[PDB]
């Protein structure tokens, strides 16, 4: 999801 | 002599064990226990909603991190400090970070690595204070956190 993309991008999960 | 770190650790650790074990922590509060108690109550409200809202996404992040021991927690600290120094600061990100910490702490309890929970709470705190100290003191610390969410 957009609201946590900043966190999920760092982890590598692309579809947040 | 770091009060902000001390109070922040006390709050974040208690939240993480509570979420991991499913039992509240009746251990008596410290110096500013009034604020810490209400901040912990606030966390139970907003932190549980974040974890519910992003359960599938939190799981996918945890699966890519592959946290099984204390050294994997250290690799998480690297990621946390990088994104919490990107120049964007608001209360929602702080809640999300602690909420994901509670998510990870639940996983550590499931895999019988409860000894890694306290190191996890300390690392989230160290990232929080090192990167957001000046902003936090401007918001009046955990008093502002309590007031912002109710």
Residue numbers in the entry:
A (entry chain B): 152 to 167
B (entry chain A): 0 to 149
Paper text:
Here we introduce RFpeptides, a denoising diffusion-based pipeline for designing macrocyclic binders against protein targets of interest. We tested 20 or fewer designed macrocycles against each of four diverse proteins and obtained binders with medium to high affinity against all targets. X-ray structures for macrocycle-bound myeloid cell leukemia 1, γ-aminobutyric acid type A receptor-associated protein and RbtA complexes match closely with the computational models, with a Cα root-mean-square deviation < 1.5 Å to the design models. RFpeptides is not limited to generating macrocycles with particular motifs or topologies; the diffusion process generates macrocycles with diverse shapes and sizes and selects the topologies appropriate for the protein being targeted. Among the four targets tested here, binders for MCL1 and MDM2 have helical motifs, binders for GABARAP have a β-sheet topology and binders for RbtA sample looplike conformations that make extensive contacts with the flat surface of this target.
